[PDB]
Amino acid sequence: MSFLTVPYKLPVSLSVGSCVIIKGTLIDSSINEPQLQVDFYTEMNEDSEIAFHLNVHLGRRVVMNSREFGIWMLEENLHYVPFEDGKPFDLRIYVCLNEYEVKVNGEYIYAFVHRIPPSYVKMIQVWRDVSLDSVLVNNG
Ligand SMILES: OC[C@H]1O[C@@H](O[C@H]2[C@H](O)[C@@H](O)[C@H](O)O[C@@H]2CO)[C@H](O)[C@@H](O)[C@H]1O
Structure with a gap:
């Protein structure tokens, strides 16, 4: 099966208990740009609110934020970067009552x-x- 064409967009409806599962492979192929970006939008429109934004800078950081009323809010930075150049990853974003739980390769x-x-x-x-294999939302 061919990798999904990127940028890849998916209409969704999330509830508590939903899980977004993203499988793919990142490569060290960019200059001053992340190797992966995931944005959760409130409308089918790139100018809408971003409830959740995640980007990966291999070997440096995972960055998370929101974009509310056009403004990037408080940036949350992780220096644990489980993603590796050329190796497959399994990214799970689980919707809880108070937070998203971000999980990569079986680590919280x-x-x-x-x-x-x-x-x-x-x-x-x-x-x-x-190189994106699949993006899906499970309800349960
Ligand atoms: O916070 C998410 C937001 O980051 C912007 O880039 C930030 C960068 O993360 C920070 O290290 C730097 O000091 O400031 C930049 C803001 O100009 C990205 O441009 C944006 O797309 C989001 O990724």
């Missing part, structure tokens, strides 16, 4: 407290130079 790495209710998310975009 961060709890991002909700800033916009996740019930307002309508579209996920996964982009940058990722």
Whole structure:
């Protein structure tokens, strides 16, 4: 099966207990730009609110934030970067009552407290130079 074409957009509806599962491979192929970006938008429109934004800078940091009323808010930085150049990853973003639980390759790495209710998310975009196998939302 061919990798998904990026930028990859997916209409979604998230509730507590939903899980976004993103499988792919990152490569060290960018200059001053992240190797993976994931944005959760409140409308099917790139100017809308971003409830959750994650980007990967291989060997440096995982960055998380929101974009509310056009403004990037408090940046949350991790220096634990489980993603590796050319190796497959399994990224899970689980919607809890108070936070997203961010999980990579079976490790719990961060709890991002909700800033916009996740019930307002309508579209996920996964982009940058990722070789993307699948993006799906499970309800349960
Ligand atoms: O916070 C997410 C936001 O980051 C912007 O870049 C930041 C960068 O993370 C920070 O280290 C630097 O000091 O300031 C920059 C803001 O100009 C990205 O431009 C944006 O797309 C998001 O990734």
